[PDB]
Write a protein that binds this ligand. Structure first.
Ligand SMILES: [Zn+2]
Lengths: 49, 92, 102, 54, 147, 176, 1111
């Protein structure tokens, strides 16, 4: 799955407490269709395509 | 458009993975290129490179035994951005 | 949230709907495949355009005509069954169909 | 030929949308067989029916 | 993916099958008359009539007592009617009208260039407007224009 | 065959037409069609009325009943990029100039009715329902003022004579 | 010449054409009389292939006859199509809105087999529409043209695609029939051969060969050498013919219990039982020529055959083998080659006879299913073809072809050139043809087989470039629907005159020379190294001995409209394309003066356009008027040619015809007798001759803008009469009946002055925007009043007036006189539709002056709006006080590559002033190869350059050198072609000489008054509540998505909120905005739009719980 970087870092900042484990992340370079469709607001992604 | 779509390009020219001299070979009707590592390790083998392409010229043409970079473009054409992300990170 | 939709918004939460949501949205149960009487051009009862289910076609008038002013509003005529109100509730009121098989 | 224009089968009146007094009205409670309650506002001087399609 | 999606939320997955189908309000599917009695239905009315007919026929068949072939044929027809209502042209042959024109279901009110999104939500006809042909105005100031 | 023709009469048309009217529509169609095969010309309402032993106005009403509606979701242009539903004037929508003309009518009318005295304007407003939309008549007005209905009619006639004077009327003459 | 009353227009043509221009409407007329079987067609077909004279109806009725039931005990046949006369003439049908038709009579014949009878009748088949003299149909009184359609002829097509995964040539075939089932024989990535039959999951050959009944030994015998065929024979993995037949059936009846008699017959069904499979006459000829099966044998048996299928397989595998030619047993050998599907030997032309024949075939099928249905249910010894044949699905198919089909197009007649050019139109889109989204880029190009068959220039510059074309000048249609082209055959280097029509295949066989070649007055060439065209579009220098065909003239490649552009060979193809597409858009002026510089194609393409009255047979004039001409024939008879004065065209333009003959003149047959709309003494006149100058003046001619004199407005030089048709009907209703009357409601007896005593206005009363045309009032019923309205009726005593007025008001922004009032009635027993009591049409006309913003253009694509109509004094005048009339810009000339306008300008000045080459001591060196009577010319003498053989540049310098003076001794324009203009405004002379001359420019139909539009508050849409659309209503302009992006990018948030809420959809907000504007208050705060709420209820209708949450 593909998640945003800030949410990823904030989740690791939350989960280093309460017992420490990192989720392992690698950067991806995704195209602009998939970037627009995997947005947070369903309304824009519905209105696009 | 294929740059912004992050497609794999038509004239795909694969890039290097580690420095060293090159293992150049002209196979049956197309090429066969392999990187000789310097630590070393496992040799990265690039088999299915068409002879319809061209080798990369710079400064002279790519000759055998020449010392390549970490992400030196081997053939001539268009590099896919996925591979240069995976090799040379976000900045490059 | 706001049902007449004054401009105060914080979210817009979609969700998969259930049958207890659907028959709570509705104001009636359409159960006849009729729209309009061919001769008088008025909507049928329990049809796809029934003023009992969906609201009046005329501003502050019931179907039998026994109430025709604003002073009778919010109430329901005890014979025709059509709630006397403004005639833009036919823009918004929904109905439902109880299926016989899932 | 003509025109185009069309009308919904119904009149659109415009009067005062007053709210201070109305015709006063009752509230009756009908019940289905399966425990469902429904409230229907009838007018005061109105013969309330015994059964009602809810 | 979808299993944890149904787990995390408060969504029961019971709503994927459907028991009561709702009806869009009458002015959104209006039957307007033109000047001269040629009416104008809105092409959803026929799909709702198909669903209402097939549902009432199923109800009378179950009340009357019918063999299993007829009842399962009727339930398959009910299924295809609801499928045509939510998305005509999705599964199998699109339900045609007169002139062999495929009909416009609820999914075809949103998809493509002619849905509500690209046609009426984002780009609207506006009042207080006008157009004309243009000509060159070489005596005007830069902030002026002809009219 | 009976069940199929019965349900075909029920569920073929959008607006429902009952079976007897469906049968006389089909008889009129078959008669007009066979006369189109035999004469070669489409016949007349009086010819069809004489042929079906009915009246020409009944023939006209059947001809009005026969027509099926055309859909709002066909392609209006010679290519398909617009529907018919995007080209129909909503002739019951708020015209947005009669509304402001009506509000200005109400303001000017309250001014002109305030140019009189108070019993007079009260009688006019109750007689024509300008305060609640309920048109009070002569006995209710004489009851709420505590006089006889003939006095109310005298005041009504006197004020309506006052209003027909053009000084109280030039500002209202343009509102028709 | 060869046209008797022609104007004397001297040509610069160095050559001579052998062949005349043909009968420019033959592509319509000969096709339609091919469909009927007119005797002129009958004898012409007897001239050119006599053995099978069959009309299209005879073909359909033969392929229908006989019709037998499943019993086989009775049969029904058809024969002898035959028309009556037409039931009403042309003008009466066009007036009374009748379709100009004529009845079909068909001798039917019912035969019972068991007892033995014939039942012969003469069945009325239907009223069939009839082509007029001008090549148009008249449907419902309107006039309609059926456009010819390009499509790809059925046959066998061969191509290969390379495979970049493998780098192997992959040959294939597509045996495309008409209304059948396809089958394709490919060669895949391996060395096998899938035989995909009817779109479903491939195949090897051997299953199909055994499925026809070939043993494995017969496969090896027919395919010995073929390594792929023997490889698939070894990989056949199924032995037994029926064992292949069952596979077969399973793959083609997936969901059916197989049996041996079904798969034996269903394979014979799809390809051999011809009721479900018919490659046509064209398909049979194409396959039999490509494979060379039959040579002299006639065309019959329109299904396939096993010989053709195995020859297809052998040809495909030898094509993969890389063979050159292939002999089939039983036929002469053919070359082995792949096939372009764009070459005109493969892209046929379904003309109008083919189209109407296809519609009649699909009508007769629907008739036939009904007939063989009631061939059983009817009782025997009782019935007859009167009781069998149903003509209602037949007549319905014709009426739904001519009405509502995208080839039954509306006749685009705003001038005779577009009237001609909407005919002769090739359109590759339509039913059975490719649509524009399915259109690739490769079909839109110009394949080198288009030369002489379709013009490369003329095509619409929108999104239809290449999909719509037009036929060549000399082109002529092959009876199989191909496009033949004349050629002058040359034998042994002697150019003969035997003109031989070749289609695109024999254009590839042979070799083709040029008409601008040095013929040495004997048929002999001069130089041996001659330009020529080879098969693949190549251009070579053959020695002058192998040339076996030469072109008939130059300008052969080009269309009709494009051949009316002088100096066309100088212009670039883009601007020539624009000029050809804008020459069809000129409007008929009130004067219509002929052009000075022209081509040959102004006279011929006007008398062939139809809109000019032509003297039918010779004689003398008796009586002229403005309305009729009575000729006196030489033998007793007289005949009145009625005019057409002030008739409305199909695009609102005038259609006057005034005579050009006097009362004592003698006319000959085939002479122009009366000019049409855009004609002048016989020939075309699309505009006027205006004095032009090419300086950039004061920024008003900036970036294609054009300025004009005021003389054009004063003297009515550019002025078109427009005629508009308004229409209302008085129909029935539920409440009662409507009535055309003068008792309208609340309306001052001021506006009821123009109206007559019974409704409609008086003829000649000038109207303005919003006036009353037809007093027409409807009932309303009973609606309770508002109390304020009630007391207004109480004060003023005016009644309720229960009727409601919907009068015919003339719409906004229109005016002008009222020419004519055509009224119908039920009381006259006129044909009116059901529920209509009284119809009336009112024709309104105005006389538009030329005005700033209107669109003008020359004949070279140099369009441009009118920037500013200056007065006549502030215009650059010559040394002789003559002002120029328009002023074009310089900067549009060199970068658009269209110096044809400059050559036209200089030659136009030469023809205006008149030259005289003083040949005192011999002829000068430029003027040697000029024709005679060009050595001198008169002022305002008409000249003409043909297209690809015209004025040379040395000849233009030679004419421009001696250009005899006006009235004084004054050569105003020197040898360079320029002149010393004075500034009309300031007064000083310009410091540099400026080009002047006479250029021929047109007035396009993009007038400002048809385009300007405004809306404050108007009609509203129905379901959504947006404002409506288009100039027919008010409507607003679509503030679309990209403009929303633009105003986001500025950051203007409030204006975006405005334009998307309280100008379009905030339903309660709009009236508050209007009220607050009138009262002068502030604009209120906007609410929720309406289309969002519509979206909300649609999403709640799709069982999606959508809810707005507060916090
Ligand atoms: Zn009621």
């Amino acid at each position: 799955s593909l998640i945003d970087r800030a949410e990823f870092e904030a989740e690791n900042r939350r989960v280093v407490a309460e017992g420490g484990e990192p989720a392992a992340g690698r950067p991806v370079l995704m195209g602009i269709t998939k970037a627009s469709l995997a947005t947070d607001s369903w309304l824009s992604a519905a209105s696009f395509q | 458009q294929e740059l912004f779509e992050a497609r794999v390009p038509r004239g795909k020219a694969p890039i290097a993975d580690v420095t060293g001299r090159v293992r150049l070979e002209d196979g049956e009707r197309f090429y066969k290129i392999t990187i000789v590592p310097d630590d070393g390790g496992e040799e990265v083998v690039y088999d299915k490179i068409s002879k319809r392409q061209r080798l990369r010229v710079f400064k002279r043409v790519l000759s055998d035994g020449d010392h390549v970079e970490v992400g030196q473009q081997l053939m001539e054409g268009s590099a896919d951005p996925h591979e240069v992300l995976r090799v040379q990170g976000p900045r490059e | 949230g706001a049902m007449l939709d004054v401009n105060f918004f914080d979210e817009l939460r979609i969700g998969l709907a259930t049958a207890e949501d659907i028959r709570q949205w509705s104001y009636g149960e359409v159960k006849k495949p009729e729209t309009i009487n061919y001769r008088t051009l008025k909507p049928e009862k329990d049809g796809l355009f029934c003023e009992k289910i969906f609201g009046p076609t005329r501003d502050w008038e019931c179907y039998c005509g026994k109430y025709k002013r604003v002073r009778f509003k919010g109430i329901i005529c005890e014979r025709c069954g059509v709630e006397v109100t403004r005639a833009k509730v036919r823009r918004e009121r929904m109905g439902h169909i109880e299926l016989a098989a899932p | 030929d003509r025109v185009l224009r069309g009308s919904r089968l119904g009149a659109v009146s415009y009067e005062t949308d007053r709210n201070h007094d109305l015709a006063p009205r009752q509230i009756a409670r009908y019940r289905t067989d399966n425990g469902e309650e429904f409230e229907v506002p009838f007018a005061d001087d109105a013969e309330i029916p015994g059964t009602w399609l809810c | 993916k979808v299993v944890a999606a149904f787990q995390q939320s408060g969504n029961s997955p019971m709503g994927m099958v459907l028991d009561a189908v709702p009806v869009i309000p009458p002015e959104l599917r209006p039957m307007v008359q033109l000047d001269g009695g040629r009416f104008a239905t809105s092409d959803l009315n026929d799909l709702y009539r198909r669903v209402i007919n097939r549902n009432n026929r199923l109800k009378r068949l179950i009340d009357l007592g019918a063999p299993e072939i007829i009842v399962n044929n009727e339930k398959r027809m009910l299924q295809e009617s609801v499928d045509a209502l939510f998305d005509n042209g999705r599964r199998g042959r699109p339900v045609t009208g007169p002139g062999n024109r495929p009909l416009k279901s609820l999914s075809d009110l949103l998809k493509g260039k002619q849905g509500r999104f690209r046609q009426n939500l984002l780009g609207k006809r506006v009042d207080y407007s006008g157009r004309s042909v243009i000509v060159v105005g070489p005596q005007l100031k830069l902030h002026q224009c002809g009219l | 065959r009976q069940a199929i023709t019965r349900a075909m009469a029920d569920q073929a048309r959008t607006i429902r037409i009952p079976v007897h009217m469906v049968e006389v529509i089909n008889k009129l169609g078959r008669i007009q069609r066979e006369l189109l095969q035999d004469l070669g010309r489409e016949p007349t309402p009086e010819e069809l009325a004489k042929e079906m032993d009915i009246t020409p106005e009944k023939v006209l009403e059947i001809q009005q009943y026969a027509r099926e509606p055309i859909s709002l979701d066909q392609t209006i242009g010679d290519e398909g990029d617009s529907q018919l539903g995007d080209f129909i004037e909503d002739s019951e929508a708020v015209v947005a100039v009669d509304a402001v003309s009506f509000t200005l009518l109400q303001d000017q009318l309250q001014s002109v009715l305030d140019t009189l005295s108070e019993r007079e304007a009260g009688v006019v407003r109750l007689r024509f329902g300008l305060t609640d939309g309920q048109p009070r008549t002569l006995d209710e007005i004489g009851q709420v003022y505590g006089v006889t209905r003939e006095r109310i009619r005298q005041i009504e006639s006197k004020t309506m004579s006052k209003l027909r004077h053009p000084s109280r009327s030039q500002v209202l003459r343009d509102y028709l | 010449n060869s046209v008797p009353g022609a104007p004397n227009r001297v040509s610069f043509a160095k050559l001579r054409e052998p062949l005349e221009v043909p009968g420019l409407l033959d592509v319509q007329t000969d096709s339609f009389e091919w469909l009927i079987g007119s005797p002129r067609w009958r004898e012409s077909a007897a001239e050119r292939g006599d053995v099978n004279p069959v009309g299209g109806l005879e073909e359909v009725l033969y392929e229908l006859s006989p019709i037998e039931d499943f019993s086989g005990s009775m049969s029904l046949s058809f024969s002898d199509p035959r028309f009556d006369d037409v039931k009403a003439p042309v003008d009466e049908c066009k007036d009374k809105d009748m379709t100009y038709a004529a009845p079909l009579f068909v001798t039917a014949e019912f035969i019972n087999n068991n007892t033995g009878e014939i039942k012969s009748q003469t069945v009325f088949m239907g009223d069939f529409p009839m082509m007029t003299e001008k090549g148009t149909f008249i449907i419902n009184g309107t006039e309609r043209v059926v456009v010819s359609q390009l499509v790809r002829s059925p046959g066998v097509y061969f191509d290969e695609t390379i495979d970049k995964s493998t780098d192997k040539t992959l040959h294939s075939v597509k045996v495309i029939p008409s209304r059948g089932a396809w089958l394709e024989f490919d060669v895949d990535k391996r060395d096998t051969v899938g035989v995909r039959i009817d779109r479903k999951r491939r195949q090897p050959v051997t299953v199909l060969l055994k499925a026809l009944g070939w043993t494995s030994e017969q496969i090896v015998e027919r395919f010995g050498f073929s390594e792929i065929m023997r490889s698939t024979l070894e990989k056949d993995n199924t032995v037994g013919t029926d064992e292949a037949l069952l596979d077969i059936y399973r793959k083609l009846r997936p969901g059916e219990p197989p049996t041996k008699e079904s798969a034996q017959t269903l394979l014979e069904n799809l390809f051999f039982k011809e009721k479900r499979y018919d490659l046509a006459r064209v398909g049979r000829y194409k396959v039999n020529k490509k494979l060379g099966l039959h040579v002299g044998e006639p065309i019959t048996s329109s299904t396939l055959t096993e010989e053709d299928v195995v020859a297809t397989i052998e040809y495909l595998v030898r094509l993969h083998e890389g063979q050159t030619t292939m002999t089939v047993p039983g036929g002469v050998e053919v070359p082995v080659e792949t096939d372009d599907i764009d070459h005109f030997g493969n892209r046929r032309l379904r003309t109008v006879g083919e189209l109407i024949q296809n519609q009649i075939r699909v009508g007769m099928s629907r008739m036939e299913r009904v007939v063989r249905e009631r061939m059983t249910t009817q009782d025997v010894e009782a019935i007859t073809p009167q009781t069998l044949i149903n003509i209602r699905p037949v007549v319905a198919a014709i009426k739904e072809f001519f009405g509502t089909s995208q080839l039954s197009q509306f006749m685009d007649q705003n001038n005779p050139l577009s009237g001609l050019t909407h005919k002769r139109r090739l359109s590759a889109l339509g039913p059975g043809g490719l649509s524009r989204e399915r259109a690739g880029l490769e079909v839109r190009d110009v394949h080198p087989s288009h030369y002489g068959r379709m013009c490369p220039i003329e095509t619409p510059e929108g999104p239809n470039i290449g999909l719509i074309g037009s036929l060549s000048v000399y082109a002529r249609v092959n009876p199989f629907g191909f496009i033949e082209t004349p050629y002058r055959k040359v034998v042994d280097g002697v150019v003969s005159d035997e003109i031989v029509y070749l289609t695109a295949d024999e254009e590839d066989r042979h070799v083709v020379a040029q008409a601008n070649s040095p013929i040495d007055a004997d048929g002999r060439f001069v130089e041996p190294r001659v330009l020529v065209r080879r098969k693949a579009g190549e251009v070579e220098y053959v020695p002058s001995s192998e040339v076996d065909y030469m072109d008939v003239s130059p300008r052969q490649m080009v269309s009709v409209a494009t051949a009316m552009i002088p100096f066309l060979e100088h212009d670039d193809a883009n601007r020539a394309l624009m000029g050809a597409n804008m020459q069809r858009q000129a409007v008929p002026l009130v004067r219509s003066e002929a052009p000075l510089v022209g081509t040959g194609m102004e006279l011929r393409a006007a008398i062939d356009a139809g809109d000019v009255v032509v003297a039918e047979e010779s004689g003398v004039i008796e009586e002229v008027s403005a309305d009729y001409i009575t000729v006196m024939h030489d033998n007793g008879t007289r005949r009145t040619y009625r005019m057409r004065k002030f008739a409305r065209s199909n695009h609102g333009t005038c259609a006057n015809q005034c005579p050009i003959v006097d009362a004592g003149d003698r006319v000959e047959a085939g002479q122009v007798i009366a000019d049409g709309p855009c004609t002048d003494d016989g020939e075309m006149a699309l505009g006027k001759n205006l004095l032009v100058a090419i300086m950039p003046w004061e920024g008003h001619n900036y970036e294609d803008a054009i300025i004009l004199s005021n003389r054009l407005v004063e003297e009515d030089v550019l002025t078109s009469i427009h005629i508009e048709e308004h229409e209302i009907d008085a129909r029935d209703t539920k409440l009662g009946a409507e009535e055309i009357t003068r008792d309208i409601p609340n309306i001052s007896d001021e506006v009821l002055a123009d109206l007559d005593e019974r409704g409609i206005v008086r003829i000649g009363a000038e109207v303005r925007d919003g006036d009353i045309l037809v007093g027409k009032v409807t009932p309303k019923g009973e609606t309770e009043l508002t109390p304020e309205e009630r007391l207004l009726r109480a004060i003023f005593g005016e009644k309720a007036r229960e009727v409601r007025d919907t009068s015919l008001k003339v719409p906004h922004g229109e005016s002008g006189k009222v020419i004519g009032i055509r009224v119908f009635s039920r009381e006259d027993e006129d044909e009116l539709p059901a529920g209509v009591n009284e119809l009336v049409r009112v024709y309104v006309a105005q006389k538009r002056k030329i005005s700033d913003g209107d669109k003008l253009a020359g004949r070279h694509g140099n369009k441009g709006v009118i920037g500013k109509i200056l007065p006549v004094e502030d215009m650059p005048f010559l040394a002789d006080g003559t002002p120029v009339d328009i002023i074009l810009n310089t900067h549009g000339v060199p970068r658009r590559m269209n110096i044809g306008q400059i050559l036209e300008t200089h030659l136009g000045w030469c023809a205006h002033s008149g030259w005289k080459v003083d040949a005192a001591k011999g002829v000068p060196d430029w003027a040697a190869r000029l024709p005679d009577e060009l050595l001198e010319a008169q002022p305002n003498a008409i000249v003409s350059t043909p297209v690809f053989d015209g004025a040379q540049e040395a000849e233009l310098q030679g004419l421009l050198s001696c250009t005899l003076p006006n009235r004084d001794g004054d050569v105003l324009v020197d040898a360079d072609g320029k002149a010393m203009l004075f500034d009309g405004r300031s007064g000083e002379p310009f410091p540099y000489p400026v080009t002047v001359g006479y250029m021929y420019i047109m007035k396009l139909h993009h007038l400002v008054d048809d385009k300007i539009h405004a809306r404050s508050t108007g009609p509203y849409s129905m379901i959504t509540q947006q404002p409506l659309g288009g100039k027919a209503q008010f409507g607003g302009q679509r503030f679309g998505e990209m403009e929303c992006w633009a105003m986001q990018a500025y950051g203007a948030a409030y204006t975006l909120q405005e334009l998307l809420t309280i100008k379009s959809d905030d339903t309660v907000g709009r009236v508050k905005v209007y009220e607050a504007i009138v009262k002068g208050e502030n604009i209120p705060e906007p609410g929720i739009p309406e289309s969002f709420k519509v979206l909300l209820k649609e999403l709640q209708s799709l069982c999606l719980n959508v809810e707005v949450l507060s916090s």
